[PDB]
Amino acid sequence: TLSAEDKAAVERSKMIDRNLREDGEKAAREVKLLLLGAGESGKSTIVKQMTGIVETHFTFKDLHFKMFDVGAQRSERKKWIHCFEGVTAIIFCVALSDYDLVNRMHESMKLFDSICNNKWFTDTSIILFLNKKDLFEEKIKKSPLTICYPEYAGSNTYEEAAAYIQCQFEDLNKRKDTKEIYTHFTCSTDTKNVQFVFDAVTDVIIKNNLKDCGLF
Amino acid sequence: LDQLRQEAEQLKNQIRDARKACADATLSQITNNIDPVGRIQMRTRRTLRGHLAKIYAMHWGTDSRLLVSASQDGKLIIWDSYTTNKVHAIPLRSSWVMTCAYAPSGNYVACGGLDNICSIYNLKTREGNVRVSRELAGHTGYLSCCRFLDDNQIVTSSGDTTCALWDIETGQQTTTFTGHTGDVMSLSLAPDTRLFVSGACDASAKLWDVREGMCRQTFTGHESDINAICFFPNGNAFATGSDDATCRLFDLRADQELMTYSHDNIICGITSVSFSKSGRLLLAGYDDFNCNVWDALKADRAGVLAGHDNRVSCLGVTDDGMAVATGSWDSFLKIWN
Amino acid sequence: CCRIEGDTISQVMPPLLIVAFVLGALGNGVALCGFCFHMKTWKPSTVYLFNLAVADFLLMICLPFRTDYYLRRRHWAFGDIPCRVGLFTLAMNRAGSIVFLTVVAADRYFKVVHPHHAVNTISTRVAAGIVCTLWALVILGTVYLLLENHLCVQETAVSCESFIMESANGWHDIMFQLEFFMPLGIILFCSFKIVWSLRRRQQLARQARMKKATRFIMVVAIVFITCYLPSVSARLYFLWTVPSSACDPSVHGALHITLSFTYMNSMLDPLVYYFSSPS
Amino acid sequence: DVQLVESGGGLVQPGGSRKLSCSASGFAFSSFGMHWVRQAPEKGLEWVAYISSGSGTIYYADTVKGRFTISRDDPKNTLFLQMTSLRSEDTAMYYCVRSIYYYGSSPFDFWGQGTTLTVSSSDIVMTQATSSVPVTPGESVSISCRSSKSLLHSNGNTYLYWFLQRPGQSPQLLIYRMSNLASGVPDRFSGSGSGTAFTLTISRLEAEDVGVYYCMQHLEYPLTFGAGTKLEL
Amino acid sequence: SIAQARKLVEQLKMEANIDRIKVSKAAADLMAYCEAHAKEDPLLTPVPASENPFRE
After folding, report:
1. Looking at CA atoms only, how far is residue C118 from chain A in angstroms?
2. I want to staple C267 with a disulfide (CB 3.0 to 4.6 A). Which of B2, B256, C24, C106 is the partner?
3. Would B2 be classed as within a structural domain?
4. Mutating which of A3, A7, A16, A18 best tests the D interface, going by the most D Cβ atoms within 10 A?
């Protein structure tokens, strides 16, 4: 009981729906990584290998990645943080060598605790990138971590200091079962960083796939 | 310094004392005689099932038939509510969108989000497709709510504590208002399109003046950030919904809070607030997966619109009042009646 | 054609059939209601679980009539056109529940061992098409006993039981064999691969959620094999004893009860598959 | 800007298989519905065929059904019309009408330049009454068009259009859906009416308005054009 | 700097010197407007489905 114009309009709507469905299916294959950091942690170093939110697109091993850098969005973080709920993973970058003063390890701890223990990112596995390995190594070779860590009882060598940093940051989280936290020393000038990111994304992708089948 | 804050403090408590003195009785005492509106039944007349992600905002065209909804999948859809058709599908440049608008003439729609850019799209074109007409930039924070004064002037509220009034033709701000101390998250214009109000994140709503730009009055009394504001149809009042499970209606002339809409069962915040044609029913979209129609004069819940699967993030009422639309975080819309 | 079927079959089988009927009907109806009214946005493997439940309910739709068949002194009491319908829908239960089981197992293998493969990214329409293809295939395979009249009555106690119950043709025996075996290999291979792949992911295997998942993966194959082995073993015994087989008051009466488990699998399956899912 | 150019005309013997092609440039051709309208020399207009967007719907006029083929080529923005077994009556000039259908859209907004072809030797009936009304500038004229079936559909919008063909070139749209004004037309023109009664009023007439006027329906296919009202002086 | 305090108090006592009205009379005006326009509100008083555009 539709006139000619009404039938043509319905046909146009069906064509638009088909285009929307195709585009949504194409975009479902995309992997979205939210990138965070302390600002001067060296996110430029991480993003090197491939006035607002900067989106970076790169493809590895026949998989498309879409990394977002919030960057200069200096405002109330909690109001726009929920827009990123549902991302495949979250990349957190903290500078190892930035423990001199103006201390910044404590600010990084505060940011990590505020991000990981957030109601939105309950299940999103967080990847932790520790960079500036050589600078931190030289600094510990010069001065110990008691300046930042008065409650330190260990060796004045880089391996134990790195292990302490890693276990402390991993212990910053609370939900040790519903959330998975990875770690990697990323100052090596290779493609190991993107390989590690790909492996973490594969693990979380398998985790999401196990939900649809009901095998969980 | 000390003397400056001293006269600021004395003027401020003088103002509060004047406000208290000008108050004699709340409207609950005078209006208790009138009857309640009674139970309100709502039926989902239509459902719109085109989107694929979260729905953040929508606006009703002046014809009260076309509505445009914005979603995180980077698609602007203009629906035909009578037949649930898809007039247009606009692929946005940046998939992050937090607001939407529909010009009164129906010619243009506006979109904005985390990119701090309030782009303007042109609908009626000889080429037959939808293309951008002007991309506005100059904001250092995320866009929150952009509204159309007319076909040539658009006023937008950003997250850098600044509300700006743009100019489509030239492309730069004709006037900038800055009085807030926190993120501004919602906007609403008076029916005469002369005055407008903004809801900041510091539990304070300011009344502006688009002619020259200066804060006529400051309204406070909330305990958290204000997430949505809307004008009373009379143009002499407005209602605010904050994040502390409360909805308050202020009086522009009296310069004082009037009513509080709160209940013990509700603890979630408010995402959107709008009135009806006559303003008798105040609609608020909570985060408890449903709306709650509030009797605007008796502060009593007159019903519930519970049909959504996720948090309701938007709301709107047509000019004639024949329909009310909601869009939740699931990719759905419902046209209640 | 031996008519006395034996004894202690009616006092034994109909109770199990009734219990299985009640349990199945309830669980399968629940599952269908949960699938149709809840858990929206149809995705792959949702179609497969829903369709397996649909086939199982198709079996339930005709189970009782069959029961009474021997419930009343094993004597039949309907006109054949329907007997034909009943044995057709039983043979549709079989080789359609198995088809869907194998499809689900293969889908899990493809969605856990090859997550990046585009097969897991297929749309719902294509999966529905594959479903319709398989359905049509099994219907075509089972139409053969529909387009015939198979009653070696030779007695007041009209016979309907058509398990060949004697020597068979290709369409009768061999298929029953292939049907029980090949899916067993498919399910075992897919389950072992899934368990191995999930175990060799030490980071992910410390939440015990993977332990629960692999336990369910193992138990699915375990229950399938323990539910379908006895029927095929009894059929093989009958086939390899035919030159020396009388009516066998034991083998006859044993094979029916062993098949009763072939029916009870339908009742127990939803309690595994749906209840496993936290949704 | 928007351009529509067609070619393929000439002289052909009856029973041939001449092909007509129309090329477009200046608009999103992939989302537009195509039409074809012919015009015998001293006659009015009549529909030929129509193909919707995406080539999903293909109709024809009963006069040429089964002998004419329609086809569009989206990547090359070209429209083809295949003709078979031409008859002597097919001598007419053909157009390349465009139209896009959605709520509030204005179909038949642009008309192609047109090409001429010559061969050697239940529908709604629209009556336009008069055929030639002398007019003088500065006056207010009224053009009446009548229909057999009621044109007021249940949706509340009456499907009827108006068309002005100035002497020499292709016609242009004036009023769509009997009340709305076409884009770019002056405010001078205005139309109204009711079911099976339609009047187009031109207050304060001047030059540039001489030519024939055509009233057309769109309620069910096939579309039928009016006889035509012709103006001069 | 200190100009922020000057601007704050300037705006504040520009806002201070405005007229105040009785709250009761404003509430009465609001309720009178609402009662007057209640008749033209289809959402408050349900409309029969005969002319309701969403009757389907």
Report:
1. 9
2. C24
3. no
4. A3
Query: Minimal CA–CA distance to B180: which of B244, B225, B116?
Result: B225
B114 vs A79: CB contact, 8 Å cut-off?
Answer: no
D165/D205 same-domain check: yes
Please provide the DSSP assignment of C26-58 as one string: HHHHHHHHHHHHSS-S--TTHHHHHHHHHHHHH
For an interface test with B, the pick among D102, D155, D172 (most B C-beta atoms closer than 10 Å) comes out as D102
Suggest the residue from D102, D217, D224 to mutate for an interface test with chain A (most A CBs closer than 10 A): D102
Query: D104 at the A interface (CB within 8 A)?
Result: no
> Among D119, D138, D169, which residue terminates a domain?
D119
- Three-class SS state of A56: strand
Which domain, by its residues, includes B67?
7-336
Residues 80-109 of B with CB under 8 A from D: 80, 85, 87-88
Q: Measuring CA to CA, which residue among C84, C64, C80, C59 is closest to residue C13?
A: C64
Is residue B320 one of the residues assigned to a domain?
yes
Question: Is there a single domain that holds both residue D102 and residue D182?
Answer: no
CATH (domain of D194): 2.60.40.10
**Interface residue of E8, E11, E23 to substitute, partner B, most B CBs within 10 Å:** E23
In the numeric block, which tokens belong to residue A135? 């600078």
| List of chain B residues whose C-beta atoms are within 8 Å of the C-beta of residue D28 | 127-129
Chain B 64-103, CB below 8 Å of chain E: which residues? 81-82
Place of tokens 């025996």: C173
Q: By CA distance, what is B28's nearest residue in E?
A: E27
Could you give phi then psi for residue B240, rounded to 5 degrees?
Answer: -125, 140
User: Backbone dihedral region of D8: left (phi > 0), alpha (psi from -120 to 50 degrees) or beta?
Assistant: left
Ramachandran sector of residue D175 (left: φ over 0; alpha: ψ -120 to 50; beta: rest): beta
Determine how β-strand A31-35 pairs with β-strand A63-69. Answer: parallel
Method: cryo-EM
Distance from CA of B199 to the nearest CA of A (A): 14
B 231-290 residues inside an 8 A Cβ radius of D: none
How many domains, in total, are found in chain D? 2
A4-204: CATH topology is Rossmann fold (3.40.50)
Which residues on chain A are in Cβ contact (under 8 Å) with D221?
A: 4
Query: Looking at D90, D119, D148, which one is the last position of a domain?
Result: D119
Domain residues for D80?
A: 5-119
Number of domains in chain B: 1
Cα angle for residues C248, C254, C256 (degrees, 5° grid): 110
> Cα(B251)–Cα(B309) distance, rounded to whole angstroms?
35
Across the interface, whether the CB atoms of A79 and B86 are under 8 A apart is answered no
> Across the interface, do B128 and D102 touch by the CB < 8 Å criterion?
no
| Interface contact A15-D54, CB threshold 8 A | yes
Q: Resolution in angstroms for this experimental structure?
A: 3.4
Indicate whether B169 belongs to any domain. Answer: yes
Say yes or no: D17 and D94 in one domain.
Answer: yes
The enclosing domain of B113 has a CATH number of 2.130.10.10
- Domain ranges across chain E: 1-56
Domains of chain C: 13-268 (1.20.1070.10)
D109, D134: one domain:
no
Angstrom CA distances, B201 to B155, B242, C72, C95, D175, stand at 19, 9, 78, 63, 52
> For residue B267, is it within any domain?
yes
| Domain shared by D15 and D34, yes or no | yes
Chains D and E touch (3+ CB pairs under 8 A): no
Say if residue C271 is exposed, middle or buried (CB neighbours under 10 Å; 0-12, 13-18, 19+): middle
Taking an 8 Å cut-off on Cβ atoms, the answer to whether D28 and B127 are in contact is yes
CA distance B85 to chain A (A): 6
Which residue type is seen at C17?
L
Are D77 and D138 in the same domain? no
